[PDB]
Amino acid sequence: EPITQAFAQQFSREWIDAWNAHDLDAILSHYADGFEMSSPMIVQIAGEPSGRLRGKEQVGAYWREALRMIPDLHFEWIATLAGVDSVAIHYRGAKGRLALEVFHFGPDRRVVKALAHYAG
Amino acid sequence: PITQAFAQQFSREWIDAWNAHDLDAILSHYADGFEMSSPMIVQIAGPSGRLRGKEQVGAYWREALRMIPDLHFEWIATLAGVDSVAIHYRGAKGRLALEVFHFGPDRRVVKALAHYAG
């Protein structure tokens, strides 16, 4: 059974809402221990040429600071598309960038790997 | 990392190749031995949803073009990640789609993952 649309939509609505609520515990609840995070923002900010960070402590530290610095952070959900073991959430970012985040899920239905993409 | 200039040009190329119904051109963007996943493959081929290589994957896309001879992809957006590009488009029958492309050292696709709206 590939990722169901039931799941993809409900995941998307909770993930968007968790970010919009600036509720880091809620956000992190969707992720597996040791999840991998890839983002152009990691290259730039974290100073990691690979653009990768791993785990809730390490990735959470950045997100915690994002919420602190961007106190009225808000994402607009545009679309969700389902793949085999992944969901892609297309949304408009906190500063108007267009975003497309791919989430790969593990056995427990939590995100084991996420990759961010942007334009604009 | 991938640049925005690269991503947008790649996307123009990929959408155009599909809209020209040009299997050779489509495949020219991919590395030999590339991997591709799609929830369509799960259904047809039967869990990973994966095919590999230009022989195997080309067969499938050859069949797609034969089944939908007036296939047209309406481009919606292209986004850049660290080693990947995401192309969002309206595909066959107006279904929204997304293809994620991971690139190798010669700027060709080594891994691609299809996603569809429902």
DSSP string, B47-64: ---EEEHHHHHHHHHHHH
Residue B48 belongs to a domain with what CATH number? 3.10.450.50
Q: Which residue in B98, B102, B103, B113 has the most chain A C-beta atoms within 10 A of its own C-beta, making it the best mutation to test that interface?
A: B98
Q: Are the C-beta atoms of B34 and B54 separated by less than 8 Å?
A: yes
H or E segment and range at residue B45: helix B39-45
Q: Are the C-beta atoms of A92 and A11 separated by less than 8 Å?
A: no
Q: Write out the DSSP string of B69-84.
A: TT---EEEEEEE-SSE
User: Which chain A residue shows the shortest CA-CA distance from B100?
Assistant: A102
Q: Are the C-beta atoms of A120 and A113 separated by less than 8 Å?
A: no
CA–CA separation, A99 and A77 (whole Å): 10
CA–CA separation, A96 and B5 (whole Å): 19
CA–CA separation, B92 and B41 (whole Å): 16
CA–CA separation, B33 and B53 (whole Å): 4
C-alpha distance from residue B70 to each of A65, B66, B67, B91 (Å): 50, 9, 9, 11
CA–CA separation, A107 and A68 (whole Å): 32
Q: Are the C-beta atoms of B81 and B14 separated by less than 8 Å?
A: no
Both tokens of B108, joined, read 């060709």
Closest-CA distance, A58 to chain B, in angstroms, reads 18
CA–CA separation, B50 and B42 (whole Å): 8
User: Which chain B residue shows the shortest CA-CA distance from A49?
Assistant: B1
CA–CA separation, B100 and B109 (whole Å): 10
Q: Find chain A residues with C-beta within 8 A of B9's C-beta.
A: none
Q: What share of chain B is helix, strand, coil (3-state, %, to 5)?
A: 40, 35, 25
Output the CA angle B111-B115-B117, nearest 5 degrees.
170
Both tokens of B93, joined, read 């029958």
H or E segment and range at residue A67: helix A56-69
Q: Are the C-beta atoms of A116 and A38 separated by less than 8 Å?
A: yes
Q: Find chain B residues with C-beta within 8 A of A39's C-beta.
A: 81-82
Both tokens of B46, joined, read 């039967």
Closest-CA distance, A113 to chain B, in angstroms, reads 14
Q: Are the C-beta atoms of A22 and A94 separated by less than 8 Å?
A: no
Amino acid at A47: G
How far does Cα B58 stand from its chain's mean position?
11
How does DSSP classify residue A71?
T
Cβ contact (<8 Å) for A82 and B115?
yes
The backbone torsions φ and ψ at residue B26, rounded to the nearest 5 degrees and listed phi first, read -55, -50
Total number of domains in chain A: 1
Closest-CA distance, B113 to chain A, in angstroms, reads 7
The domain in which residue B79 lies consists of: 1-118
User: Which chain B residue shows the shortest CA-CA distance from A116?
Assistant: B81
Resolution of the PDB structure in angstroms: 1.6
CA–CA separation, B52 and B42 (whole Å): 14
CA–CA separation, B98 and B85 (whole Å): 10
How does DSSP classify residue B10?
H
Q: Are the C-beta atoms of A104 and A30 separated by less than 8 Å?
A: no
Amino acid at A56: K
How does DSSP classify residue B92?
G
How far does Cα A69 stand from its chain's mean position?
18
Q: Is B70 exposed, middle or buried (0-12, 13-18, 19+ CB in 10 A)?
A: exposed
Q: Find chain A residues with C-beta within 8 A of B42's C-beta.
A: 2, 84
β-pair type (B30-37, B109-116): parallel
Helix (H, G, I), strand (E, B) or coil at B111: strand
CA–CA separation, B69 and A37 (whole Å): 39
CA–CA separation, A73 and A104 (whole Å): 24
